[PDB]
Amino acid sequence: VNSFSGYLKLTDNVYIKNADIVEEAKKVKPTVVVNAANVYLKHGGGVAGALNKATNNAMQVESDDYIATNGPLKVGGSCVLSGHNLAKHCLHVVGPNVNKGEDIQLLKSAYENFNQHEVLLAPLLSAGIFGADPIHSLRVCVDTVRTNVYLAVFDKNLYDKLVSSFL
Numbered sequence: 001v002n003s004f005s006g007y008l009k010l011t012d013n014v015y016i017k018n019a020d021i022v023e024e025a026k027k028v029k030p031t032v033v034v035n036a037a038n039v040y041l042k043h044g045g046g047v048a049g050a051l052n053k054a055t056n057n058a059m060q061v062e063s064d065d066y067i068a069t070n071g072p073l074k075v076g077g078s079c080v081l082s083g084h085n086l087a088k089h090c091l092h093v094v095g096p097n098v099n100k101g102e103d104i105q106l107l108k109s110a111y112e113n114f115n116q117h118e119v120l121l122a123p124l125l126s127a128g129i130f131g132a133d134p135i136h137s138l139r140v141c142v143d144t145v146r147t148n149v150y151l152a153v154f155d156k157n158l159y160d161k162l163v164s165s166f167l
Ligand SMILES: O=C1CCCN1CCSc1ncnc2[nH]cnc12
Pocket: 019, 020, 021, 022, 046, 047, 050, 123, 124, 127, 128, 129, 152, 153, 154, 155, 158
C-alpha cells in the first residue's frame, strides 16, 4: 500500500491521473519524482520549469553544480539529485526532444531509467514541449517500465484521450 490516490490503473504496474505533478509531489512527498530534464539540466519550462519554480530555484542551483562537476547528461540518460521540498529524490531523465531532431527510439532508453526505482511519480517522457506524441510515450512507458509508476498528466483533455485510446 502507498499513498497515491485517484489514479486509474492501466496495467499491473502503471497508473495514471489528471494532475499537476508539482501539486501531486507536494501532497504525496514520494520517494522519487521524475523530472523531464534536458542534458544541461536547464529547467526553463515545461515540467522542469514548474518543478524548479516550486523549489524556489534550489533545483537549478544544485543542477548547475552537478553539471559543473560531471558535464552534460546523455539523451536517454538520467541522474539522481535531491527532491528538495517535493520528494526525497528527483530522478532527472532526458527523453529525446523532437523539436531538436533527436531519435525517438531513445525514448525507450529514457524510460529504462525508471526501472532502477521501485516506485515513482512521473510525467510522460518527451511529451509537452519535447514534441513527441504522448500516446506513443504512454505505450513505450507501459512496454518498458516494470516498476510501479504513477503518471501525472497536466492537461485534462490529453488525459482523457490517453485513457480513451489506451490498448
Ligand atoms: O499535461 C501535459 C500537456 C502537454 C504536456 N503535458 C505533460 C508534461 S507538462 C506537466 N506534466 C505534469 N505536471 C505538470 N505541471 C506543470 N506542467 C506539467
